[PDB]
Coordinates of C-alpha atoms and ligand atoms in Angstrom, one line a residue:
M1 CA 0.0 0.2 0.2
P2 CA 1.2 3.7 -0.4
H3 CA 2.7 6.2 2.3
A4 CA 2.3 9.4 2.4
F5 CA 4.3 11.6 0.1
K6 CA 7.7 12.6 1.3
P7 CA 10.8 14.7 0.0
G8 CA 12.2 13.0 -3.3
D9 CA 9.3 11.3 -4.6
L10 CA 9.0 11.3 -8.3
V11 CA 5.5 12.7 -9.9
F12 CA 4.0 14.6 -12.2
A13 CA 2.4 17.9 -10.9
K14 CA -0.5 19.1 -12.2
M15 CA -1.5 22.4 -12.7
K16 CA -4.1 24.6 -13.7
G17 CA -3.3 25.5 -17.4
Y18 CA -0.1 23.1 -17.8
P19 CA 0.2 19.7 -18.8
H20 CA 1.1 17.1 -16.0
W21 CA 4.7 18.3 -15.3
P22 CA 7.8 15.9 -14.4
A23 CA 8.6 17.4 -10.9
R24 CA 10.2 16.3 -7.4
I25 CA 8.7 16.6 -3.6
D26 CA 11.4 18.7 -2.6
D27 CA 13.5 19.1 1.0
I28 CA 13.2 22.3 2.5
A29 CA 16.8 24.0 3.4
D30 CA 17.6 24.7 6.9
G31 CA 16.6 28.3 7.2
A32 CA 14.4 28.3 4.1
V33 CA 10.4 28.9 3.5
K34 CA 7.8 26.3 4.4
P35 CA 5.3 25.7 2.2
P36 CA 1.6 26.3 3.7
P37 CA -0.2 23.5 6.0
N38 CA -0.7 20.4 4.0
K39 CA 1.2 21.7 0.9
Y40 CA 4.5 20.6 -0.1
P41 CA 7.6 22.0 -2.2
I42 CA 7.1 21.0 -5.5
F43 CA 10.5 21.2 -7.8
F44 CA 9.6 20.9 -11.4
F45 CA 12.5 19.2 -13.8
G46 CA 13.2 21.5 -16.9
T47 CA 11.9 25.0 -15.9
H48 CA 13.5 24.2 -12.1
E49 CA 10.6 26.2 -10.5
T50 CA 8.7 25.9 -7.1
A51 CA 5.1 25.5 -6.1
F52 CA 3.0 24.5 -3.6
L53 CA 1.3 21.9 -4.1
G54 CA -1.6 19.2 -2.1
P55 CA -1.9 15.2 -3.2
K56 CA -4.9 15.9 -5.1
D57 CA -2.2 17.8 -7.5
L58 CA 0.3 15.0 -7.3
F59 CA 0.9 11.9 -9.7
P60 CA 3.3 9.2 -8.5
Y61 CA 6.0 9.2 -11.3
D62 CA 5.8 5.2 -11.7
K63 CA 2.4 4.7 -12.2
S64 CA 1.8 7.1 -14.4
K65 CA 4.9 7.9 -16.4
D66 CA 3.1 5.9 -19.7
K67 CA 0.3 8.4 -20.1
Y68 CA 2.4 11.3 -19.3
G69 CA 5.7 11.1 -20.0
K70 CA 5.5 12.0 -23.7
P71 CA 7.1 15.3 -25.6
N72 CA 5.2 18.9 -24.8
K73 CA 6.2 21.9 -27.0
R74 CA 5.9 23.6 -23.8
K75 CA 9.2 25.5 -22.1
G76 CA 11.2 23.3 -20.3
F77 CA 9.3 20.3 -20.3
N78 CA 11.2 18.1 -22.4
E79 CA 14.7 18.9 -20.6
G80 CA 12.5 18.0 -18.1
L81 CA 11.9 14.6 -19.5
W82 CA 15.0 14.1 -19.2
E83 CA 16.1 14.9 -15.5
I84 CA 13.3 13.2 -13.8
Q85 CA 14.1 9.6 -15.9
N86 CA 17.9 10.4 -16.0
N87 CA 19.2 12.7 -12.7
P88 CA 15.7 13.3 -10.9
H89 CA 17.9 13.4 -7.4
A90 CA 20.6 15.8 -8.6
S91 CA 21.3 19.6 -7.5
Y92 CA 19.4 21.9 -9.9
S93 CA 20.8 25.0 -8.3
Ligands
LPU1 C1 4.8 23.6 -14.9 S1 5.7 25.2 -14.9 O1 5.6 25.6 -15.9 O2 7.4 24.6 -14.9 N1 5.1 25.9 -13.9 C2 6.0 26.0 -12.5 C3 5.6 27.0 -11.9 C4 4.5 27.5 -11.7 O3 4.1 28.9 -10.8 C5 4.0 27.6 -12.9 C6 4.8 27.3 -14.4

């Protein structure tokens, strides 16, 4: 059975107006801004941006890759696909 989400989990993250996007649950660094209650820090591969999202918008990567892991025109997406597949736990600072 599933556990709750935890830092390092790989997902497709969905925001309004964007296709399901390769992403990870981030850690919060000591001294860094924490997300709101009930939200996780989501690092989106390719664009390297963070947003705060709840589980409803988070699709586990293994299960979802066959549907969502196809090239997309949007900026950063295809770079994103390479990252999540090839070095999803790397520092992208
Ligand atoms: C799916 S995306 O384009 O990487 N996206 C992440 C950050 C958000 O605020 C909007 C842009």
